[PDB]
Amino acid sequence: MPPYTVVYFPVRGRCAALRMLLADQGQSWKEEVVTVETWQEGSLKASCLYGQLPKFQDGDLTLYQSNTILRHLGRTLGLYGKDQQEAALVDMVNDGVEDLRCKYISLIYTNYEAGKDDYVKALPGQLKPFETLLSQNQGGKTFIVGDQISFADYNLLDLLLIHEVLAPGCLDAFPLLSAYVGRLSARPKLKAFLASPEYVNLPINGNGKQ
Amino acid sequence: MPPYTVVYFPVRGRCAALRMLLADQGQSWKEEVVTVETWQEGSLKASCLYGQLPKFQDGDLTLYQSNTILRHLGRTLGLYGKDQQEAALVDMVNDGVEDLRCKYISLIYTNYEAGKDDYVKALPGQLKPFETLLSQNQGGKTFIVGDQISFADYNLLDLLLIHEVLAPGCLDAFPLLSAYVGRLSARPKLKAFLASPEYVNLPINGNGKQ
């Protein structure tokens, strides 16, 4: 049985990136799916540290918080830069990704209808820093930080994939982000996972909006 | 000339925790206070990766994102747990602190009048996870994770202090969090910084609400 377990609603959401990470790194794991019927029963929610999912298990280490899981796998799998300075740039990227994801989540779940036009308006100036970071790292030909992939790459990649669904062609303004998505998506294990039923047959969000 | 530069508005805000950390760690740093007016000029802001402050300098290295600063000082000053397992626990704490800080920032800056009592009413359930964490670590007599202070202690302490201003008595039902606040605030270098004008005469937030 795998050392890892992902406990989550039947959605991509805040586990999509860590799932890509494990897949591309060839790690096995178990998915425990939580129905909203189980969730409304209240027992599992009451036992979650912050009342929420994802919950993640690595042996007897139980974690909550999606970016905590991301940094842990990045720590234990060597996806956290080459040295102490790169580690800090990796965080800086991932914190920006988290910032934009929180805006994305706020739109999807609380104001999709009245908010979508302004969000798509503001989107280029939100994506530009990631384009800027790429332009400053090997002219955007490798990864978001340094010369080896990090957990920020997978979280950023997810953030870029789901915005393409929300605002088709939003990467047309960003040649390096665009080639970045195509390049990372083509990694054999990752490509295989993204095409697979366990990824394709889950919706992005739990409320059916995208 | 100290190794560190902090670039921020004349408020505590998202710089209070990292300031407490540097002060308690006996570290020297330079404040570059950015007045709201110069921030309206637009040159500095446009130079910021995410167009936001704080900005932070460590020698040649320039960082953005308050939690990126917190982790970098934690990584470089040894305030990140004794191993990778503790490192994940420190992150889980800090991501919980950040989640509640974002809700605090939302109330302060976008809904203070109509949102306060709903927020105050929900506050106990928001604070209990950190009492629970204390309850599971040496009976709450030491730090939020393990046996050494971490960057998460400083960020959690700030979150607690600003909440006792928002809702006096919000720690009264939590003996371990209340004892923890008193013990951390009694640390000598931290004690002097928290009593100093440079902490006391800054407002908590950029809109004067608290």
Type and span of the H or E element at A6: strand A4-8
User: Is the same domain home to A86 and A40?
Assistant: no
Whether residue A66 is annotated as binding a ligand: the answer is yes
- Closest partner CB to A68 (pick from B65, B88, B125): B88
User: Is the same domain home to A21 and A107?
Assistant: no
Chain B residues lying within 8 Å of A71, measured CB to CB: 87-88, 91
Type and span of the H or E element at A127: helix A112-135
* Residue A56, strand partner residues: A6, A63
User: Is the same domain home to B72 and B95?
Assistant: no
- Residue B38: count other Cβ atoms within 10 Å of its Cβ: 13
Instruction: Using DSSP, state whether A8 is helix, strand or coil.
Output: strand
Q: What is the largest CA-CA distance in chain B?
A: 51
Q: What is the DSSP track for chain B?
A: --SEEEEE-SS-GGGHHHHHHHHHTT--EEEEE--HHHHHH-HHHHHSTTS-S-EEEETTEEEE-HHHHHHHHHHHHT-S-SSHHHHHHHHHHHHHHHHHHHHHHHHHHH-HHHHHHHHHHHHHHHHHHHHHHHHTSGGGTS-SSSSS--HHHHHHHHHHHHHHHHSTTTTTT-HHHHHHHHHHHHSHHHHHHHHSHHHHTS-SSTTS--
Amino acid identity, position A162: I
- Give the separation between CA A79 and CA B198, rounded to whole angstroms: 39
User: Is the same domain home to B192 and B177?
Assistant: no
Q: Is B168 left (phi over 0), alpha (psi -120 to 50) or beta?
A: beta
Chain B residues lying within 8 Å of A80, measured CB to CB: none
Let me know: does A28 contact A1? Beta carbons within 8 Å.
no
- Give the separation between CA A150 and CA A82, rounded to whole angstroms: 10
- Is the Cβ pair A132, B91 closer than 8 Å? no
Handedness of CA A86, A153, A51, B85 (dihedral sign): negative
- Give the separation between CA A146 and CA A82, rounded to whole angstroms: 8
User: Is the same domain home to A48 and A8?
Assistant: yes
Reference A29, options A3, A50, A53, A49; nearest CA is A3
How big is chain B, counted in residues?
210
Sheet bearing A4-8, strands edge to edge: A29-33, A4-8, A55-58, A61-64
User: Is the same domain home to B173 and B129?
Assistant: yes
Reference A49, options B158, B175, B171, B96; nearest CA is B96
User: Is the same domain home to B54 and B120?
Assistant: no
Let me know: does B20 contact B192? Beta carbons within 8 Å.
no
> Which residues lie closer than 8 Å to B161 by C-beta, 6 or more apart?
B181, B185
User: Is the same domain home to B117 and B66?
Assistant: no
**Structure determined by:** X-ray
- Residue B99: count other Cβ atoms within 10 Å of its Cβ: 16
User: Is the same domain home to B91 and B147?
Assistant: yes
Query: Closest chain B residue to A87 measured between Cα atoms?
Result: B72
- Give the separation between CA A66 and CA A98, rounded to whole angstroms: 10
Let me know: does A69 contact A19? Beta carbons within 8 Å.
no
- Give the separation between CA A192 and CA A171, rounded to whole angstroms: 23
Q: Give the CATH number, domain containing residue A126.
A: 1.20.1050.10
Task: Classify burial at A136, counting beta carbons within 10 Å of its beta carbon; exposed 0-12, middle 13-18, buried 19 or more.
Answer: exposed
Domain count, chain A: 2
Reported structure resolution in angstroms: 1.9
Q: At how many degrees (to 10) do helices B175-186 and B188-195 cross?
A: 90
Q: Give the CATH number, domain containing residue A63.
A: 3.40.30.10
Residue A167 gets which letter from DSSP?
S
Let me know: does B33 contact B8? Beta carbons within 8 Å.
yes
- Give the separation between CA A51 and CA B128, rounded to whole angstroms: 11
Residue A61, domain extent = 1-79+188-209
Instruction: Using DSSP, state whether A63 is helix, strand or coil.
Output: strand
User: Is the same domain home to B194 and B183?
Assistant: no
Closest-CA distance of chain A to residue B53, Å: 13
Amino acid identity, position B133: L
> Mutating which of B49, B75, B82, B92 best tests the A interface, going by the most A Cβ atoms within 10 A?
B92
Instruction: Using DSSP, state whether A46 is helix, strand or coil.
Output: helix
Beta strands in A9-160 (DSSP E): 29-33, 55-58, 61-64
Whether residue A119 is annotated as binding a ligand: the answer is no
Spell out the alpha helix ranges (H) of A3-42.
16-24, 36-41
How big is chain A, counted in residues?
210
Whether residue B45 is annotated as binding a ligand: the answer is yes
User: Is the same domain home to B43 and B110?
Assistant: no
Contacts of A173-177 with C-beta under 8 Å, sequence gap 24+, read A173/A124, A173/A127, A174/A124, A174/A127, A174/A128, A174/A130, A174/A131, A176/A131, A176/A134, A176/A135, A176/A139, A176/A140, A177/A127, A177/A130, A177/A131, A177/A134
The torsion angles phi and psi of B25, rounded to 5 degrees, stand at -85, 5
- Closest partner CB to A87 (pick from B49, B75, B132): B75
Reference B158, options B82, B94, B113; nearest CA is B94
User: Is the same domain home to A57 and A89?
Assistant: no
Residue whose pair of structure tokens reads 């993204």 in the numeric block: A194
Residue A50 gets which letter from DSSP?
T
Reference B204, options B172, B168, B159, B174; nearest CA is B159
Let me know: does A19 contact A6? Beta carbons within 8 Å.
yes
Handedness of CA B87, A129, A111, A36 (dihedral sign): negative
